[PDB]
């Protein structure tokens, strides 16, 4: 099959005129198949999501969203670690990257975290990360 890299690179190409579901859904399929799929996926996603190129970052979030809905407990657990969530917090927070990221990207992330605290209540670290952003008045 195609590697996670090859998948994610197609799925988030800033050259895409529209969303590439073959690549997006193939990424999810592939991380679910591979033993160390989920931890690699989460590393590749964080980087893409932190891109200065908005359409790369927005596509990457769409991948994140998609696979969170379709996969996981292995995937759900990787995303529910601070190792990953910190990279999101960096994006949405003025202290860090927040000042040079669009409202669109940051609002998308905040939305996603919320949706997770509700659909995945056992992933208590996501809720920790969300309540921390709320207490700081980032949410929203």
């Amino acid at each position: 099959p195609e590697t996670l890299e090859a998948r994610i690179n197609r799925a988030t190409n800033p050259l895409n005129k529209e969303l590439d579901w073959a690549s997006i859904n193939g990424f999810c399929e592939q991380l679910n198949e591979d033993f160390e799929g989920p931890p690699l996926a989460t590393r590749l996603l964080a980087h893409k999501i932190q891109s200065p190129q908005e359409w790369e970052a927005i596509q990457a979030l769409t991948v994140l969203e998609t696979c969170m809905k379709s996969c996981g407990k292995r995937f759900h657990d990787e995303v529910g670690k601070f190792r990953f969530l910190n990279e999101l917090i960096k994006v949405v927070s003025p202290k860090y990257l927040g000042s040079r990221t669009s409202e669109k990207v940051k609002n998308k992330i905040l939305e996603l975290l919320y949706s997770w605290t509700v659909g995945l209540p056992e992933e208590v670290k996501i809720a920790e990360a969300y309540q921390m952003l709320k207490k700081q008045g980032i949410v929203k």
Binding site: F82, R83, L85, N86, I89, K90, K125, M132
Partner: peptide, 7 residues
């Protein structure tokens, strides 16, 4: 086995 929560 995990980072600390980033404040």
């Amino acid at each position: 086995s995990d980072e600390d929560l980033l404040e």
